[PDB]
Design a binder for this molecule. Sequence first.
Ligand code: OQI
Length: 236
Amino acid sequence: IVGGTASVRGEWPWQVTLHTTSPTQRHLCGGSIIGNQWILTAAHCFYGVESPKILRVYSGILNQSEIKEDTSFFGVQEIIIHDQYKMAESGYDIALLKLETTVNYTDSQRPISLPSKGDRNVIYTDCWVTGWGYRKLRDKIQNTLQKAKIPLVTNEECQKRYRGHKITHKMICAGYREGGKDACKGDSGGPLSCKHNEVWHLVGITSWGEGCAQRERPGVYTNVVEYVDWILEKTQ
Ligand SMILES: COC(=O)Nc1ccc(-c2cnn([C@H](CC3CC3)c3ccc(-c4c(-n5cnnn5)ccc(Cl)c4F)c[n+]3[O-])c2)cc1
């Protein structure tokens, strides 16, 4: 997260850190708890992943340095990548992880609601992007979960900034005209969370952008509301 600030324990209880264990253990991507056995993340995260055997999902983490050889985690039973996914910039950047067991919800690990049926025309003004990613294009993974408030921008403005890409209704863009706050390397797969009527909704999945926090270059997110049917079909 560029231009962000440190989170506190319990602040974003749906945020998970997805680790790979090959060839060494390390944070790979963010993700969001959306059900007791279900993580929503980005399909791009699994480019190099030979199978679910090498994944570990950690919840209730604030600092990466909390994770030791005895820290409990959830195994991944299945990776479900949208069957049209090809690359992040062309969309469908969405995946479900089915965990090997059910999360017991606690203060530190809680689900975030999907965008609600009938909210298709809500104007979200309180959106936040979170993660352990770089603070700049050439940085390192951050020990403490970072947060930044970023405004949504219209797809029409987003397309004008990305004339080499097809910005579709299955994408949602967010960023400041002058840059300064954005996701960056290591944040993808995590949530763009928006609070409406004091309820958090998983509005976006951190996906791609040209640079990090550049002027006139919004971050691009998977538009979760357009995948609710697909999620419900996979999880039901
Ligand atoms: C020691 O290093 C470790 O152990 N960890 C470590 C873990 C992951 C990575 C790493 C590198 N890239 N990525 C992902 C894509 C990869 C498949 C996972 C990625 C792509 C794009 C964006 C992104 C951007 N950016 C544009 N330019 N950069 N960011 C802008 C806006 C928005 Cl909205 C964005 F989403 C964010 N991420 O995360 C992850 C590096 C090191």
